[PDB]
Amino acid sequence: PAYRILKPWWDVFTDYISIVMLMIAVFGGTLQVTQDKMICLPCKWVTKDSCNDSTGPTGIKYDLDRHQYNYVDAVCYENRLHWFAKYFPYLVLLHTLIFLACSNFWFKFPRTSSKLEHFVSILLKCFDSPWTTRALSETETGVLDKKEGEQAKALFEKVKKFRTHVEEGDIVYRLYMRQTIIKVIKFALIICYTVYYVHNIKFDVDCTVDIESLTGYRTYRCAHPLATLFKILASFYISLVIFYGLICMYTLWWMLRRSLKKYSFESIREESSYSDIPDVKNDFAFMLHLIDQYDPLYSKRFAVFLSEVSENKLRQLNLNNEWTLDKLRQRLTKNAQDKLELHLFMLSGIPDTVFDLVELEVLKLELIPDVTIPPSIAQLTGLKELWLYHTAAKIEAPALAFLRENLRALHIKFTDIKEIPLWIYSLKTLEELHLTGNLSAENNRYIVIDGLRELKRLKVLRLKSNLSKLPQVVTDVGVHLQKLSINNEGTKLIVLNSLKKMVNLTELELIRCDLERIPHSIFSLHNLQEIDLKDNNLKTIEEIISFQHLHRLTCLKLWYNHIAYIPIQIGNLTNLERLYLNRNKIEKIPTQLFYCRKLRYLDLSHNNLTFLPADIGLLQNLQNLAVTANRIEALPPELFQCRKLRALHLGNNVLQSLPSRVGELTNLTQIELRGNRLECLPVELGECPLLKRSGLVVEEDLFSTLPPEVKERLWRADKE
């Protein structure tokens, strides 16, 4: 079958030498059996127990009939002919048979026969893999048949299983080594003893077989016809045995000096450049040096298929066949900005059809190990946002230039600096960046982001890296930043009075920065209009008067802090358009906060607030408000003065009764009252047009107290 490739050249030569020696053995045996005789004649005069050997001549007569000739020849042949010459063909036959047995014993031993057949078959079908040729075709990738992809995946699995199963055995090598050694030693024996005894084949033989009572003679001389022929046959046989021994020594040295238990594949990965080709362990690399002696092409083809880069490409082609464009545009979803976005999570790579999703607007990556980005992403022109999460993705120069002028927002969440690609700074049209993952590492701080300056158009910079310091580079790029945002996730952000350098900062948001106060740099940042200081642990905030520097100060947030009182100086902060001070420890409300006549949106939930002053109606321009989880017990009438108010959130308070003045508020749309000890509700609450039952967040039992007309009105307003 395929066993021809197992045998090296020196196996063919030895097999044919064995065939020739077996043939001469058979011919010698069949000739020696039916025709070998020994013609003996008596010696009349015997000198020194040996034959004397000393009118027309006459024939001597010995008075012996033919039957006596037969008897004496038989006896002389039986006793006085060397057993070496008599049994030559059978000895040669035995030597050839045992040589054949040693040659093919492993072929007939079922322990290793399974390994041999499995290895040769798998090598054949891997040399027959169309994927192997395509792997060296590149020495851009095409497409693999989905069925051929399945076949190649199954072949990969079977090859890995066979490697693990066979690299551990280590018996075939031992068997062939033993066979080689046995062949060498047996050749040595049959070249020593045969040549030692070869002179014993003589044409004439003197036998004194000591038979007189039946013959009357003592010594006899005999001619054996086949002595010349048998000597020639023995010479040819021992010459062939010498050749066999030469082959045995060659094979033994080749196997011993090579040390072929490990195969390095040192040329193929140096020529095809596939470093991901692992070396072969014992009982396997010997099987591969054998094939190399037959043909190294099979070795190269099999090593290419054992390569891991080949595995990556085959798996990527399987994925490319696996995904379809229609289902991709089906799964495309609206992101937090309601733009067409599909989060790429738990995916090793990217199918090649998805790069036809030209309508993609926002992208999100997650758990993708360094996927290659072909310029086919250039089809996805609308992609203005990207969310990088734990992915060291790799792009191509056309795709790089495409995303340079097609990306305006970006969101990086890297577990390491290497996960952020180096050519991101060439994407200079980027204006919104969202960084995550610690880059404030020791002795390499802010070195990679030194290229953030080069993003000249960077205008929104969201940072979550436990920033304990404001970088000089981030400060310099921040002079043209319109909105900077830093999330210290509990770490103490420090500015070293360098935040004031970013004068053109139109908005700023610091989350969990543990500032506990507002330095003069923030006040010196006059362009701030939207500001947040969440989880800064602020205790005293009376310095917000310096926020008067912010002439167009609109939104101010100091929520999630230790704040327990509100400065009277916030009265001079009339510019405040939006405010968010929840999750603090404030217990009262001062009359000065009501001077922020531009205030429109508010949130002061989860505080110890216990009353609502009469000047709340002075803040008419409010439209949304949240005061959940406080100590408010009654609704003052002035609270109902804010007619243009639309949304409310007043949960988890100690309120007990609801004044009918809530009916005065016509513009109300949503209101939260769940978490309060109310018993009866005024009917006027159901006279607000924009307010509906869905807008009215309140307990069901209190709603049952209202007239059924109010219930019907709320439901029928909810219907349309």
Added chain:
Amino acid sequence: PAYRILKPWWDVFTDYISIVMLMIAVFGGTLQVTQDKMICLPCKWVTKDSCNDSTGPTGIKYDLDRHQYNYVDAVCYENRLHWFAKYFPYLVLLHTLIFLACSNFWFKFPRTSSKLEHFVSILLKCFDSPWTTRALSETGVLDKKEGEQAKALFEKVKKFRTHVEEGDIVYRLYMRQTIIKVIKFALIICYTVYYVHNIKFDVDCTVDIESLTGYRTYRCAHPLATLFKILASFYISLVIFYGLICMYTLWWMLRRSLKKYSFESIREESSYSDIPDVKNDFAFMLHLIDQYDPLYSKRFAVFLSEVSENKLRQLNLNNEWTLDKLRQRLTKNAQDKLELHLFMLSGIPDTVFDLVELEVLKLELIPDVTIPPSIAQLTGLKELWLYHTAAKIEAPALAFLRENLRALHIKFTDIKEIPLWIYSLKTLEELHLTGNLSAENNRYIVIDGLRELKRLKVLRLKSNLSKLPQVVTDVGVHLQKLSINNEGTKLIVLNSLKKMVNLTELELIRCDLERIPHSIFSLHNLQEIDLKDNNLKTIEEIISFQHLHRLTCLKLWYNHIAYIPIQIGNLTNLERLYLNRNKIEKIPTQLFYCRKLRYLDLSHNNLTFLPADIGLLQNLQNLAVTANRIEALPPELFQCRKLRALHLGNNVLQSLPSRVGELTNLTQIELRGNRLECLPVELGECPLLKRSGLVVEEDLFSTLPPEVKERLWRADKE
């Protein structure tokens, strides 16, 4: 075994000769084993160890028993008979076996055998290819799968050619085998024909055994000597024949130098020039196949040919794409033209030339494409887009396009992706260019043929131009519209543009001027101007625009203009003006002196007020001040009745003035992004405005009276 085709006629003849030689050797060996003896008679009258041999006849009695006769016969046969005469059949057997071994060793040599089986298996399937028959028939329906198999066969042929042409092993082995056969035949002719005289029927032996026999000389008859003589004569004749054949083959191999295959006959007959000579160890195989049957060599040359591979790829692509899928993919572009666009295809499917309804064709990364005369079958085409698609043209296609192409879009990553024959067009009017073409010492040389477009009237140069080219300046003496976008590169004109007095609309996008050059003032015929993203901060140069007596539209948006110079009041001819994404904060009253103004965009600015002169612009129809800081709408805004779309989003509007219903002509308004509180009830009297034109949220929509809600739903519905 398919190796029978590997055997030339002389190989089979040598095989038959060796078979006959083996048969006669076996016959001689078995007969010599069974019957070869000598019958000896002693000579009583001996002269000089020679038989002198000098009343009815009486027999001679030599006083010898039978066993003595047997003994003396054996002795003389062993001693006084020539070894060659006795061992002739075994020498013959040795010669036959070694001849067979020299015949088969290369077949039995695994190194050569692997290559031989690989070559024969590849050649058989090449002769079996379903595409070889078609290709040699043409010297047409092709299933996709058979095309895949043909391409795989091309790949395997290339692999084998790369792998084995380095060999030079089988040739050397066969040369050595032929040399060995020839020299061995010569030796076994010489020594045999010399010693053949030794075979005689009768021999004389003076074996000198007298102590046992008592005689001097013995004459023995060998019965089989005549038979062995006949066998030897037949065998030597056979050896002569074998040597003739071997020497003929050796000379023939040493005559034509089979190491290189000229490979010119088929390339000249079937017209496939890309069938070059194969190397050593491959020209050997091709020569041997030629010896057997050159039909298989011709069937292999096609898949060695490179025109064949390209034709097979083209055939596979054309079969892959059908008319129905192309008509399904036929869409409409933004120019209201029926548009079919193709991207990253190997070639041109020829089923496309039945869709005459196509008007705009777009090519993108479709390499090695030539434009066939079949495009004359498609006359409805009017725009061609070549995006990094280096295309060559055939004569009828270019002739048809010269009278049937009007607008051309060329996008290139390199100069050579621009075909040089495009200049010969004479009905081409609109041209759009995409790609850098600046150069050092040879700047703007590819476009030296741009002059050859005398029908060019509309031009667009997005070519990374740091300078205005000379040839474009020359060709500008007949253009109508010139579009320039240097992709942020600063544009240099420097008195090289004013010659184009025929220009009516000039667009300078991202030219990075930062200030308007003087030459543009020579364009009296200029009517619509754009200077987007040119970092313009001072725009006083418009004082010279009084020369432009038809200056109707203007756009200076995406710049850094801090203020509006009052001289705008002189440009009454302006009817539209877009100035968004600028740093302007105040609006001088002279801006409202251009009563012809109808459209205006002031988005993304530092504006905080609307002057009461806004009503002086009665012709105004559309406005966009989105992302500004306007607090309230002065009722003068409502003076302009023919307002038709307003964009007030992302502003600080607190309430909508009740005069909203006065503007009957209004068709859209934007109010999301503004600090609005309640929509006025007058919003219910809008004649043409609908919910589609009402850009506002549902929570502010609920403030509308339910009658207004019903009216808005009905207007949106139909």
